[PDB]
Design a protein around this motif. Structure first.
Motif, PDB file in Angstrom:
ATOM      1  N   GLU B  42      44.005  36.159  47.314  1.00 43.99           N
ATOM      2  CA  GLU B  42      43.575  36.984  48.435  1.00 43.99           C
ATOM      3  C   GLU B  42      44.694  37.907  48.902  1.00 43.99           C
ATOM      4  N   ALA B  43      44.316  39.033  49.498  1.00 44.02           N
ATOM      5  CA  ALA B  43      45.288  40.002  49.992  1.00 44.02           C
ATOM      6  C   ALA B  43      44.612  41.075  50.840  1.00 44.02           C
ATOM      7  N   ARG B  51      39.372  43.064  51.503  1.00 43.66           N
ATOM      8  CA  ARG B  51      39.345  42.925  50.051  1.00 43.66           C
ATOM      9  C   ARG B  51      39.884  41.602  49.485  1.00 43.66           C
ATOM     10  N   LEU B  52      39.490  41.290  48.239  1.00 45.99           N
ATOM     11  CA  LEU B  52      39.979  40.164  47.473  1.00 45.99           C
ATOM     12  C   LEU B  52      40.700  40.692  46.241  1.00 45.99           C
ATOM     13  N   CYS B  53      41.997  40.371  46.061  1.00 43.87           N
ATOM     14  CA  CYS B  53      42.814  40.896  44.983  1.00 43.87           C
ATOM     15  C   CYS B  53      42.729  40.074  43.715  1.00 43.87           C
ATOM     16  N   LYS B  82      35.958  43.254  45.793  1.00 41.05           N
ATOM     17  CA  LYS B  82      37.000  42.885  44.848  1.00 41.05           C
ATOM     18  C   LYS B  82      37.883  44.074  44.511  1.00 41.05           C
ATOM     19  N   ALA B  83      39.216  43.877  44.449  1.00 41.34           N
ATOM     20  CA  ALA B  83      40.178  44.907  44.113  1.00 41.34           C
ATOM     21  C   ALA B  83      41.187  44.354  43.112  1.00 41.34           C
ATOM     22  N   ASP B  84      41.998  45.216  42.466  1.00 40.64           N
ATOM     23  CA  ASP B  84      42.808  44.868  41.321  1.00 40.64           C
ATOM     24  C   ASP B  84      44.310  45.104  41.536  1.00 40.64           C
ATOM     25  N   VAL B  85      45.118  44.029  41.477  1.00 38.98           N
ATOM     26  CA  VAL B  85      46.564  44.101  41.641  1.00 38.98           C
ATOM     27  C   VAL B  85      47.243  44.891  40.520  1.00 38.98           C
TER      28      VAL B  85
END
Lengths: 226, 109, 142, 59
Positions: B42-43, B51-53, B82-85
């Motif tokens: 999470e972030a 959002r969720l990383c 959802k998002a992308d690190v």
RNA sequence: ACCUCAAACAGACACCAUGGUGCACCUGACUCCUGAGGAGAA
RNA sequence: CCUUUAACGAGGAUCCAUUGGAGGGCAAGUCUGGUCGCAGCAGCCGCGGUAAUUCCAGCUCCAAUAGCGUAUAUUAAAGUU
């Protein structure tokens, strides 16, 4: 420049009789069921009709504390198109040496095949005499006779051997794990052997028990020869 | 780790230091809220949206992202939740960015 | 071997085989029809639906990628299916709240490759193929 | 680096060069395509010592 | 006593758990003729 | 419409053959440029972490051919009923 071979001085009794040319065919040898212990005897009688067909070149390798160590194991077929075939396996550190070791071994293990007819005669046998089998550790083959012009109806592996044998018509069927082809080809070769070891009503008349070449030609071998 | 072995068959290393993209378009700074398992995490983004990383290749077991701290996150072109690190930073790098006045002045380390 | 070889044992053969055939996996799906009831398809090769919304779907290890699927509701059942989108940049040629045409992967029930939870893919957006959109021999009709 | 997220599609295909060298030469069909295939393989007649060459070799 | 049978027999144990991850097919068998008349000479 | 017959009707640039594939299974590139575990490919086994024979393109090559590819039912392969 400099010329002349000198190759093959026999250390084998049977080899010496061939080199002096008092044995005129391999067919005499097989009739007494002798071993053949040299690879030049066969290559003296033949050598201008023998082809080779390298089937697989397979790695194997074991484990030791320093890691892997790999040796290459290759199978090599051999046969002329008149009824003689053979097969051999050998392994070595490297490739070419293993292949050349197998081309020697396959000549050594060469045998004849017996061909027959379908249900009627018109000369020149085209197929297998009788319905035979041959097994090598859960693989088996069922060579079944077939009429003329059907071709060899088999998998790729036995289609090599049977074609070289001069067996031009055959039906087959396999059973078991044919993926491990080392079994599959040895089981085919097993079947092809049984053809002269299968009793038929033709052969029921009794043999005359003619005297051995070992006996008759012994006169030349009383010098120091072994 | 505490020394051990088999940790040299593979490419030591290190960060010879270095420097410094941003944000870009859909590619911005976030802070770690939690620390799930399995892999994801999470972030919360610094703008206000949560959002969720999600982790990215390579950075997998090549860089540990402890809990709490700034980190660079691409946003998915179409997905909101959802998002992308990407590209994490250093804690020193994050306090230099804060002193510059480019990320919002709200989170402590 | 190990079984009857009578001359009047036709009943004991033909009733045994009719029972031990049901332990086969394939046969048991065909003839109960539980296949039909459970599937989002009626056994039809294709099916048609309306888009709900794009998603990103993570890959199974070792491979790591994001696979950009969609999620779709159907016309004739109203239930939901998650469907893959093929080649690069074809996601953009699918726009939310339009119709699409779906189709199975080519393994006939099971999830294919390194992507889990997906059992369907997409072929036509609106009487126009993903090919001609991708290659550029056609254009969006809107 | 990767900048402007790695979820982005059209990436590899939208940053590659596009070039061509489309033919002026007309290729054969039907009968003659088999005729050339026959002659070029078997009736030339080139083959020499054991080799691995294949019918393609841009190596 | 000394003197006269002729086989083997050490014994009991506190505790002592857990190791960020991305490694290792790219594997085949016709070639030697380098040189020699050469080299000086040519 | 077909067959039959006037008159016009072929110099390859056009009176234009495409559909798939080239790591293995399986017939054909350890060629060139781009991308760098990203984007994508991959029935299966597996390819991509800056030297990619598998991705995106170019060239070349292979298969079938006025057809070829894909999805699904079903038979043969299965002596795995």
């Amino acid at each position: 420049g400099k010329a002349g071979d000198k190759e093959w001085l026999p250390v084998t009794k049977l080899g010496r009789l061939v080199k002096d040319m008092k044995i005129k065919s391999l067919e005499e040898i097989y009739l007494f069921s002798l071993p053949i212990k040299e690879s030049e005897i066969i290559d003296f009688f033949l050598g201008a009709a023998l082809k080779d067909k390298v089937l697989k070149i397979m790695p194997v390798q074991k484990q030791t504390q320093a890691g892997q160590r790999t040796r290459f194991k290759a199978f090599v077929a051999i046969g002329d198109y008149n009824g003689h075939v053979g097969l051999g396996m050998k392994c070595s550190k490297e490739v070419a040496t293993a292949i050349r070791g197998a081309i020697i071994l396959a000549k050594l293990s060469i045998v004849p095949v017996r061909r027959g007819y379908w249900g009627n005669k018109i000369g020149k046998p085209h197929t297998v005499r009788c319905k035979v089998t041959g097994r090598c550790g859960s693989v088996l083959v069922r060579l079944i006779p077939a009429p003329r012009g059907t071709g060899i109806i088999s998998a790729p592996v036995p289609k090599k051997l049977l074609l070289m044998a001069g067996i031009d018509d055959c039906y087959t069927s396999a059973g078991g794990c044919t993926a491990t082809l080392g079994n599959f080809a040895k089981a085919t070769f097993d079947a092809i052997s049984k053809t002269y070891s299968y009793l038929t009503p033709d052969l029921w008349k009794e043999t005359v028990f003619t005297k051995s070449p070992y006996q008759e030609f012994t006169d030349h071998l009383v010098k120091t020869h072994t | 780790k505490g020394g051990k072995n088999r940790r040299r068959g593979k490419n030591e290393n290190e960060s010879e230091k270095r420097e410094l993209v941003f944000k870009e378009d859909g590619q911005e700074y976030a802070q770690v809220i939690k620390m799930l398992g399995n892999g994801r995490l999470e972030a919360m983004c610094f703008d206000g949206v949560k959002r969720l990383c999600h982790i990215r290749g390579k950075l997998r077991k090549k860089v540990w992202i402890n809990t709490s701290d700034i980190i660079l996150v691409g946003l998915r072109d179409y997905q909101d939740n959802k998002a992308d690190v990407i590209l994490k930073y250093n804690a020193d790098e994050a306090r230099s960015l804060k002193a510059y006045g480019e990320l919002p002045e709200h989170a402590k380390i | 071997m190990g079984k009857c070889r009578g001359l009047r044992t036709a009943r004991k053969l033909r009733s045994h085989r009719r029972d031990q055939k049901w332990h086969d996996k394939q046969y048991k799906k065909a003839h109960l029809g539980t296949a039909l009831k459970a599937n989002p398809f009626g056994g039809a090769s294709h099916a048609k639906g309306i888009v709900l919304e794009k998603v990103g779907v993570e890959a199974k290890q070792p491979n790591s990628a994001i696979r950009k699927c969609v999620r779709v509701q159907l016309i004739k059942n109203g239930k939901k299916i998650t469907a893959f989108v093929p080649n690069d940049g074809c996601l953009n040629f699918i726009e939310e709240n339009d119709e699409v045409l779906v189709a199975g992967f080519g393994r006939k029930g099971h999830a294919v490759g390194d992507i889990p939870g997906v059992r369907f893919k997409v072929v036509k957006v609106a009487n126009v193929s993903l090919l001609a959109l991708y290659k550029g021999k056609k254009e969006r009709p809107r | 680096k990767v900048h402007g997220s790695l979820a982005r599609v059209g990436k590899v295909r939208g940053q590659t060069l596009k070039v061509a060298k489309q033919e002026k030469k007309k290729k054969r069909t039907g009968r003659a395509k088999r005729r050339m295939q026959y002659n070029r393989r078997f009736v030339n007649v080139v083959p020499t010592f054991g080799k691995k060459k294949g019918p393609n070799a841009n190596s």
